[PDB]
């Protein structure tokens, strides 16, 4: 599953800058697949090949194949970046092509670790590597994931505030949808732009 800087079969049609594929809740590949530790992305960011390579090199330094392993969920970089190199002003034709990039959304697993290992080696190195990634992320386990998600549900349920974003947004309460986006109706006021505020119920 090793990857390369640029796709071996680049798309012929020069795709535009599609950014609506990062500012939302991750829907595919959210859950584990026969793993115990992993990295959960608390934000949404573009990973270049360098980030992937550094992640691989940093994880490789604590590997023993007989005990634990790690497999990648993210696909290979497959989105063009338009060069428009230095020396120009705004406008005047679309630029050249740079190395391709891969997207990641909030609440997404980049690489999942499996095996019967110790619970603190992750806090030894995966904490570092999560701090390394270009977007907000954390090192999570099955029990911790369950705790966080169930507590999020409880907070959304045992909220004594009479008003939430759901009610004020869906019902267009104070003429509010004049200053929101349609995506807000389904994001529920938790994904402002490309970020993800979790403390909001």
């Amino acid at each position: 599953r090793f990857i390369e800087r640029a796709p071996l079969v680049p798309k012929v049609r020069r795709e535009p800058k599609n950014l609506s594929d990062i500012r939302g809740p991750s829907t595919e590949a959210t859950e584990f697949t026969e793993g115990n530790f992993a990295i959960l992305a608390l934000g949404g960011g573009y990973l270049h090949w360098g980030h992937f390579e550094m992640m691989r090199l940093t994880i490789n330094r604590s590997m023993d194949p007989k005990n634990m392993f790690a497999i990648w969920r993210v696909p290979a970089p497959f989105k063009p970046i338009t060069r428009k190199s230095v020396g120009h002003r705004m406008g005047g034709g679309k630029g050249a092509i740079d190395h391709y990039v891969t997207p990641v959304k909030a609440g997404r697993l980049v690489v999942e670790m499996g095996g019967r290992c110790e619970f603190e080696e992750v806090q030894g190195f995966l904490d570092q590597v999560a701090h390394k990634l270009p977007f907000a992320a954390k090192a999570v386990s099955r029990g911790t994931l369950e705790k966080m998600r169930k507590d999020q549900e409880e907070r959304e349920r045992n909220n004594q505030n009479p008003w939430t974003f759901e009610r004020i947004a869906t019902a267009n309460m104070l003429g509010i949808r004049k200053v929101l986006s349609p995506y807000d109706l389904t994001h529920k006021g938790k994904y402002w732009g490309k970020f993800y505020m979790p403390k909001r119920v």
Binding site: N158, W163, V179, G193, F195, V201
Partner: peptide
């Protein structure tokens, strides 16, 4: 981490989560 329109700011402030007060403080009672 761009700034929000002001009315969106007020909406975010008014709808902020308020947690249910515990019946008793754990320090002075289990």
């Amino acid at each position: 981490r761009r700034v929000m329109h002001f009315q969106r700011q007020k909406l975010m402030a008014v709808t902020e989560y308020i947690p249910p007060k515990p019946a008793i403080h754990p320090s002075c009672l289990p």
